[PDB]
């Protein structure tokens, strides 16, 4: 009799799995009377209740209204609910910015600790002074009487001490980090382009700690003095809307302006204005003091013998960057794979240091 | 740590004069400063360096120590918060002497770099040093130069931060304009504070001060309309918090000033009062 | 442009008209025609102009050499306002005392070193004098701005070329 | 005790009432569930509601619907709805838009280590790049060494390259995905550049594979001159390739390999532990 006691309890738990599933589908069976409503937004007030609303799902259709809601939330700049057939306003939904993958990146801030590409104290901390100042007390710019600088410029080799600063420095600030790819805003067919980015600033007005990072964009750089382009004439055209955010009604001091480029070529001088771009962080080849903090993280990853001298390897570095430092133990560790040991001799590591200097450029 | 051997350096501070400690013992002070510099904030402790400076105060003359603190502020001086205790705490010994050291303290005021431009120290204690210097200048006959010291100095410490420490500075500066003879000066000096005190829980004697000095400003102008407005908030203050002991004699001059103005939009509601129908008959006569 | 006829005190400003400069055909209707039908209507909606003469249309642009030369015909675009730099010592001094009036400045700091040597600059270099020198006081936590920080920021302020030096002609 | 007599008969009689009701209500749903419908895209994951934008350029609003799971809610999620009522029925798979616009699939080609020669010096160094992290990650995670996703080679064919890259797919037994470099550049704005993350999303989700680039010089003729502004999609394709190797990492299913006849462009930014390692002449 006790054999079924434990089984019937599992059957009752299965009945709930055999019940609550279709229970949500039955509400959709009775929902055939109400068709899924389209998209709409209030534009300009016209009559008492009914206003002018253009549906983004098609041509211009002015629908009716319902008394279930009032005109407090019916003002301009809010999403509404319009029926397909009856053509009325059902209820008031909250304004939706469509947080797509390119609208708001699912990857935010980072899972990584402090700079592994860093080690320059003067330049890295120089960026944090124009960031953390408005975050807590913006009382310094009040006595000076100046607008908070958003300018950040990065020029040099991409991906080496340059790209990863976004996923590292901005991750520890505790602010919203939205990755903004240049290949996601192209929109090859009827490009929305910069109009997509305009919808992204809605998070800045809602959430103050918001950081926007443009990742290695040389595409908008060339101004094409000949102007013989085909699809690139729209690019200089869509760039002017991006300049409006640095020009027109939008003034915040929270969202930071960061744009990176490979080379100081024909790049548009207007965006280079000393008001638009301020901090310019070069990617030089510093001494041991600059690469010291990189070697510590570089050492903690590799498990090897406790006898090593990295001071002589600093002089061995010529034209090497944060990415080339990883190459050192990467190639040196390959020689120990067939040796059935994870220990890396200090001379074996220096052999890979010279090997990167041969493949340079 | 390395602070165990410093106790052996306190023996010459007793017998030998402190002038020898300005050189020999200064070398040890430079060694402790070179252990950190700008690499980090506090490696071990910043209090020992401030304690040694305190021991060099009451020993030698104040002219030699004033020059020692000059070089310490030119470069680093350990943590920026350690500069606070290496100076402030030293001034505690001057409070028990003064006399001929008042003119010497003037050089100490100009010795620090935070009087001309605000660097790190945000507290109003240095402004109180100049504030106490004004009180000394008030007895010496200096007037015109008193108001200019406390004008832009209160903003350098806490601009938006702490209003309570800013209260005593605005009140004293407005009194300097009264003794100077310019009523329009102190009117502009108090602006940003506005009514924000009324938007905070009632602190009593604060609101009982400003309105006392604002009537003295209108005394030179002889304007009786603004005086009735400054007697308003204190009229409801003594009728709620305090008793009628100080509430009645103030009301005697409140309704006395209402006859001095051609009524008003607010004065029309000041006609009938519940609590003015008793006690003095002249309060009834004015009613 | 209909509201320009109704409400007389109205000013319509169109920034960055340089988005289109010379011409393009390519796909024809696709991703082109949008501004070519405007040019016909720029000859249309501006024909109803001159009736009220209250309409204000100001177009901002960067490079005016590649724009449409036919717009210079009277009735559409009459006179263009040139925006050079050509800032003399008398012109730059007026902006120096503008933003710095709200900031507390030490009397020992003066721009005469940067005023004499600099020639043919724009308002961007002037507006950043309150920026970079102001941020220099933030790094060191300085209240005012001394004359030294004015000369220290002069390197990054004026010369923007980080590649090789500047003015290699006479070196 | 005696309750189980009428309880077992009642619970067994409800089999068609509860479980089969899922498929009983599908009489009119299956006709709408049939593929001749209008698909859609999920743009959002008061109460509980969401927003769905159809591929017809019509954005529709719907309340809380149990036809989808809470973990299935994703932005830009390919799905499908009814032609009128707009109710999610058949959920389309992942990989929005297209997949690696050109493809050649070969499981185990005849080309092997025996059909190639003189490359055993580079193949000896190639196993420590691709082959080894594909299987055993133990020794690599202990030393924190992240192996690259491929290498670079240039030279005349028949000695290597094409026949070499195909031989690696036979030994490792992985999916062979080949997309030519001149097919990356397109006539529109970011048409092939958008396929960069697309090619990596398909490779990451479905099966291990090695992405091959045929004739890199097509997207590889730039140098440093000022004509790079002629095609802006070329440089973005390269920059999107280099910076996203760390975000798309932590699996065995994505490998980036490039090859050409000759390399006239020297790029110092192509040297990294995760980027191109071997330069094979």
Swiss-Prot record, chain A:
Post-translational changes noted in the entry: N-acetylated by NAT1.
Recorded GO CC terms: nucleus; proteasome complex; proteasome regulatory particle, base subcomplex
Signal sequence interval, chain numbering: none
Keywords: Acetylation, ATP-binding, Nucleotide-binding, Proteasome
Domain of life assignment: Eukaryota
GO aspect biological process, one term: proteasome regulatory particle assembly
Molecular function (Gene Ontology), one example: proteasome-activating activity
Binding site for ATP: 156-163
Protein function: The 26S proteasome is involved in the ATP-dependent degradation of ubiquitinated proteins. The regulatory (or ATPase) complex confers ATP dependency and substrate specificity to the 26S complex.
Family to which the UniProt record says this protein belongs: Belongs to the AAA ATPase family.
Protein name: 26S proteasome subunit RPT4
Organism: Saccharomyces cerevisiae (strain ATCC 204508 / S288c) (Baker's yeast)
Curated annotation (Swiss-Prot), chain B:
Key words, A-Z: Acetylation, Proteasome
Posttranslational modification: N-acetylated by NAT1.
One GO location term (cellular component): proteasome complex
GO terms classed as biological process: proteasome-mediated ubiquitin-dependent protein catabolic process; protein deneddylation
Similarity-based family: Belongs to the proteasome subunit p55 family.
Note in the entry: Present with 5710 molecules/cell in log phase SD medium.
Role this protein plays: Acts as a regulatory subunit of the 26S proteasome which is involved in the ATP-dependent degradation of ubiquitinated proteins.
Name this protein carries in UniProt: 26S proteasome regulatory subunit RPN5
Species this protein is from: Saccharomyces cerevisiae (strain ATCC 204508 / S288c)
UniProtKB/Swiss-Prot annotation, chain C:
Keyword Nucleotide-binding part of the UniProt annotation: yes
Keyword list, A-Z: Acetylation, ATP-binding, Cytoplasm, Isopeptide bond, Nucleotide-binding, Nucleus, Proteasome, Ubl conjugation
Covalent cross-link site, Glycyl lysine isopeptide (Lys-Gly) (interchain with G-Cter in ubiquitin): 23
An MF annotation (GO) of this entry: proteasome-activating activity
Gene Ontology BP annotations: positive regulation of RNA polymerase II transcription preinitiation complex assembly; proteasome regulatory particle assembly; proteasome-mediated ubiquitin-dependent protein catabolic process; ubiquitin-dependent protein catabolic process
Post-translational modification: N-acetylated by NAT3.
Subcellular location as annotated: Cytoplasm; Nucleus
Superkingdom classification of source: Eukaryota
One cellular-component annotation, GO: cytoplasm
Key word Nucleus present: yes
Similarity-based family: Belongs to the AAA ATPase family.
Function recorded in the entry: The 26S proteasome is involved in the ATP-dependent degradation of ubiquitinated proteins. The regulatory (or ATPase) complex confers ATP dependency and substrate specificity to the 26S complex.
Protein name: 26S proteasome regulatory subunit 6B homolog
Residue range from the parent sequence: 258 to 428 of 428
From Swiss-Prot, chain D:
Localization per record: Cytoplasm; Nucleus
GO molecular function: ATP binding; ATP hydrolysis activity; proteasome-activating activity
Keywords tagged on the record: Acetylation, ATP-binding, Cytoplasm, Nucleotide-binding, Nucleus, Phosphoprotein, Proteasome
Chief site of localization: cytoplasm
GO CC terms of this entry: cytoplasm; nucleus; proteasome complex; proteasome regulatory particle, base subcomplex
Protein name in UniProt: 26S proteasome regulatory subunit 6A
Modification type Phosphotyrosine: residues: 113
Similarity comment: Belongs to the AAA ATPase family.
Entry's Gene Ontology BP terms: positive regulation of RNA polymerase II transcription preinitiation complex assembly; proteasome regulatory particle assembly; proteasome-mediated ubiquitin-dependent protein catabolic process; ubiquitin-dependent protein catabolic process
Record function comment: The 26S proteasome is involved in the ATP-dependent degradation of ubiquitinated proteins. The regulatory (or ATPase) complex confers ATP dependency and substrate specificity to the 26S complex.
Binding annotation for ATP: 155-162
Organism: Saccharomyces cerevisiae (strain ATCC 204508 / S288c) (Baker's yeast)
Superkingdom of origin organism: Eukaryota
Gene that encodes the chain: RPT5
Post-translational modification as stated in the protein's UniProt record: N-acetylated by NAT1.
